[PDB]
């Protein structure tokens, strides 16, 4: 039976809850936001896929090594005599993520952006997460 | 096996390709590009989700019953420090979906819109396909 | 596991959606609508099973070879004190069939009639679409 | 192979029997007859759907617990020329019903209402059936 | 291996049993007794197949809505010269069913007929087990 | 799935049809039709169950080695207000068996009887099969 | 598994619990206590296997249709020398059955026997429970 | 897959509902109401969790052998800045217990006492259902 | 269909024969006699289960290490009007049991007891049967 | 065999052991008590089912972000004349949970309420744990 | 479980009923007797394993191509003192074989010996036959 | 395939050959031996089956506990023009069987008797194994 | 399921029962003993881990070919503040060990050593159990 | 074929390695080491069974919040006469366990027993794991 729902394509409704998962990040929340998680020498990038989330409606927290982001999607309004014959744009409102980062983060420092629904956080890291180079002989 | 996969919660990317769809509708096309079609009684409007996409990297063409949307979206540019640590945003490039309408439209008073990475194209309805009301007695 | 579900008889609540049907015929919607299609040499007859649903709240809009029947039946009010201890009845409102006729019909001539919850829809064939008879010698 | 025929949607015909039913309450009969019952504090609500029945080919009977709901819907009259080349309505003619009732009902003060082949039955419920209430201290 | 059972069509003596059965009724019993119960308004005819029993080996005994059937069939008697080479009918001699009745019968107005090994009995419905009519309005 | 039938006990009807037999005989036909052969040195009976079937509705014929046992049983009629609420009779009208003896029997001097719903046959065995005494030293 | 278990033989302690048994009658209670029900004309004749239960440690209580057999038997005292190394007589002390009799009882008429370890109660029926001889004509 | 959601210990939720039990008593209702029946000979007592609810909010009805306990239970509220991230507890609302005891009860001398979210309801039995005691010789 | 067999709960007629077991001790026989052994330091303790069995009626026989326990129980005798409608009691009449203990015994100071269908052997252990104390330093 | 307990809806005493739990909390302990954790932006709330449980029996002690909830609720006690024929009320006394929260909490500060066997408990956030707000540009 | 039996060697009880066999001739009947039939120019030798068959117990009978060997093997007496501990030998009294030659024998010239429990019939072949020899080229 | 072979009736042959056999007896051999041991009080009795072998051909050797019997049968001699084309008596010449009797016998005392193909041998048991009487107070 | 167990590695509580074990030795008892028997030429060296055994709770008996070790472990205590988070130490007191070794052993002459929760028992063999050596030419 | 495994009992060689375990702890090691973990509210006891291990080859080492558990057994000696014929004992020499506890220990303060192979390690918490107490109101 999983074939069959393979076979549907219904990732984004059924799929992207994302309850867990464990790659030595904790990703935690409710909804679909798919994460990117780029970690530089000096600092963190947080990529979220937050489409048709107005920028007013996310609020970003952070501290020490967790990221919170929440955010609410107005849902498709449509006429008395509109119906959605055929939709495979999730639903849910309210989406949220708590990312647990790896490194701890200077969140008095931290900048984010907000374009074509694309959040971009930049999270420096902290003086006891930056990491020395251990010369080789 | 499939439950493993399912454990994954890896539906953007290996999910959505929609090689094929049959709804009374037939949408084909190539990425993650989840739509909603709502069918209204003078119109059709189409939900084009295209998170990062730049309003001039789309191509919006019609004709007859037939859209065609063309989306490319650069990839997530990673500065040689940096690496991607884990990531859950496909990483295809060019996107495409063909969709046949139910409905003949006249593309020349087709209008779209496209805000938080949200594609809103509203179709008009030909006359050919605008239905009349079968009195009930 | 579908032989408990055999067992229970659910079949007027989580049957009968058709969200596809193929028989040379094609046939969409949402909700409980039994349709039965009588197709003569110069007509179209479709009927409707709308139990509960009031002549008023039937919409019966049809075009070329499409029939779109929209109906929504008030779901059963029930005082406080009253509870509903066993109901088989589908609780869904508003249910909807998409049938595309194999034959071009006039809908300007149409009629239809609604008795015992009974629609009964009457589609004069398109001259078009009325055949001719091959003479076997 | 059961999902090959979920698969059909072919829930009104193949289903709906009732051979029986356990739920505290005991329902027996042939054919399609969705059946919702509400049990209030001093009546009883029977709701059933007999689309396509006329109002004179119901028998209605009760007594004590038990209710008996005879009825038999026409087929559907089809023209030498016209032929039935799709139905989803079950072709069964005779269809019963008999609903063991929880409480023991006044059959002498019962009433019917008969409504867009939707059938109330009202059964005042007897003096014996109608519960006290247990103070809490 | 039920399939290699069902080649043998070994049906009235391995089967037939009648151990229980649950339809609104109680059938209970040892042996092969097929029962056929014929429920009018004001009586219930049980039909039982009694093939070889004679009618002074029938003890037919009823009381509120409970019918017992015991009867004993002489087994087919063989001269010691003669061998069943082959037999399907059941070589059982006692055999009994008690037939739990929906209503309450007057025994006392009961009769039976036993023709062809077919038993016929005619039970008069109780005074409180007659429905009364709901007018529909 | 065998099983759920075996737990219905559905032996009667869906069974004994008896299309094909093999054990040195070969017993073909249509119906519920229990044969006992018993086997003499100078005869056949074959043993018949005719439940509900009449004396003058049996044609028995026979020739060389075959034997062919036609019965037509009138249905249990049931009045207007009588309803089959349960039955385990076959509803089968017309039953008949073509038994292969697997001796040659003098057809003219074979007799039968009927009695409760049985039917034996005598057939005496021709001289031609008859088995002689292999005396043993 | 259930093989395994079954060449164990232990069928005593883990087998006999008969938290509920259903053949027209109802047979619940907690421990090992094989009961056998003699139905006659003017009695019931229950007999319970009470082994190594005190004749002052059996409860026998009965109303209307119901019995109820409440007995403990002490468990198999052993010194601090001796040890059980074999053992298949059940443990648990407190044994009860609760047998719904498909016949009123007239209880104030019931005798009792205990005789090796073996409860014989005799239960008269009541005039109600009685039944009728229907005379076949 | 059962394994798995075993692996969740998901039982209040998921778990809990109900729909039937039988083991000499009947058992019905709607949502998490972990019910213990202890049964004496002069009474019988209900223990239910109704963990949460008022005892304003609990509606206790009983006559005959049939106990209806309707109780809702105010969900959890959250403030806008609150957000549940972790919950156990069922959401559902109206929770209500049909328990069809084995005796019947003098309802007008039932007592119930609320302490710690436990309800305990006394109910006398009937002389009708009291036991009497059989002696053993 | 082991479950289905373990669902009839039938553990003492088509359980107990013990027709192997293996403990160190070997218990062979027929029929159901459950056997407990207890083993001290000069004695065997030998608890066998023999309800409904008469005291003459039990053959007790040791030499060595095996014990002999044979018995008859005769079966439940019923009235030509009373009928076993339900039974759990087996039917087998001669039951025994072969036990080999693990020591020898000396048979000339044995002693038993027949208590409430309860047999209790007291094996006094041979001299080159009992252990020694191995002091431990 | 899954199925098999899952319709006998065993889920408070075989469910809700909470061995394990990883949402990015962990949870641990023994016993019945329904966890919900609502996290604000300056505390968690800590919703515990505790029914049947006295205040007196409840030790509510934290540390860091670890919460122990230590709570033993007295069996049901009943007279040597009342038995316990149903119940699904776990028998467990002693059950305890350790609630690892994902934010440190100041225990001085801490408040907790008990009513209806619920357990509320305030818990503050300490101010290393409390979010700052990353502006989005 | 057919290797469970196979590891019982239950072959001569449990096997050799022989109810049909083919291999060009018919071999039927009931009980042990293993044939061998050895095919020569102009007799036909069949040898049959009658152990502990009286002579005068053999009934041996033949015409055309067909051979019947009846026998009764008296069971093993036991005196009462005596018990059958272990038991291969086939109960089964009444032992008989109905074997269907592939040629015609002249009866009138058979033979038979019984030695060691060894039945040695020679049937002479009919000149019928007898075949003749098709010269080579 | 078991049920192939069960089909084909190869017990003989193929079956019998015994390897093991455990059931407080050890019996071990090649070929094909039914045995039947009888345990005495005062003796055991072992029949065997050993068809088509004559009495000069059987050694019967015995001591202590274990009887051992050796016997050759001459195979089904066939002359030339003769040819074997069906057969079921096993072809295997030299049999044995070793029987470890649970009892020591005195085999000095010991006889046997060959009749029909069936050895009977009379083992009288030794004083040592001779069991006594344990009375039963 | 049984991974699902080995992934606990819940061997020494679930584990080391060792109802029975055949490798030539008989070792059968009750909870956790692991035991090592090495073989010499004049004696037998028996190796018992009772880790947390005190030396005055062994008892050491054996004769013949049979040891057995009987020892109690007192289980771990606890103060009421303290609770048992994790333990995989078994929690049965009263441990034992019947080991029948493959020689007779003077016991007389045996002596044992307890160290480290280590026995030691010395068993010299017997001089019927010394074997001699059999010189190879 | 893991069913084979655990009819062996090989659960202390084969089993016991603990990889891994997750309870709130972690628990990793190689070899035999069952450990039981008991929290107090002011100290850790671990109960380590090291049977066969001297005192002066336990390291015992501690910081923070792990525990590490060092200790070699030499392996059983045996003369070259004496051979290992049977052993449960596992051979590992080498065993280790690191404890990763739930609180900070004061190891300056820890102390450790060693009798009859039972290590018993106190660990006092430190002030930062000394939970406080939330009163309840």
Redo the contacts between chains.
């Keep these: 039976?999983?074939?069959?729902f393979?076979e549907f394509?219904a990732?984004?409704m059924?799929?992207?809850?994302?309850?867990?998962?464990s790659?030595?990040?904790?990703?935690?929340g409710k909804g679909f936001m798919?994460?990117?998680?780029?970690?530089?020498?000096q600092h963190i990038?947080v990529?979220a896929?937050?489409?048709?989330?107005?920028?007013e409606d996310?609020?970003?927290?952070?501290?020490?090594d967790?990221l919170?982001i929440?955010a609410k999607r107005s849902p498709?309004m449509?006429?008395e005599?509109?119906?959605?014959?055929?939709?495979?744009?999730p639903e849910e409102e309210e989406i949220?993520r708590?990312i647990?980062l790896?490194a701890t983060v200077k969140?008095?420092n931290?900048?984010?952006?907000?374009?074509?629904?694309?959040?971009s956080?930049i999270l420096p890291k902290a003086e006891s997460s930056i990491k020395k180079g251990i010369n080789i002989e």
């Design positions: 039976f999983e074939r069959m393979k394509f990732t984004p059924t799929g992207t809850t994302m309850i867990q998962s790659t030595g990040i904790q990703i935690s798919p994460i990117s998680i780029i970690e530089g020498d990038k990529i896929w937050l489409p048709g989330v107005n920028k996310i609020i970003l927290n952070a501290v020490g967790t919170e929440r498709l449509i006429t005599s509109e119906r959605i014959i055929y939709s495979e744009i949220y708590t647990k790896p969140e008095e931290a900048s984010a952006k907000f374009e074509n629904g694309v959040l956080v």
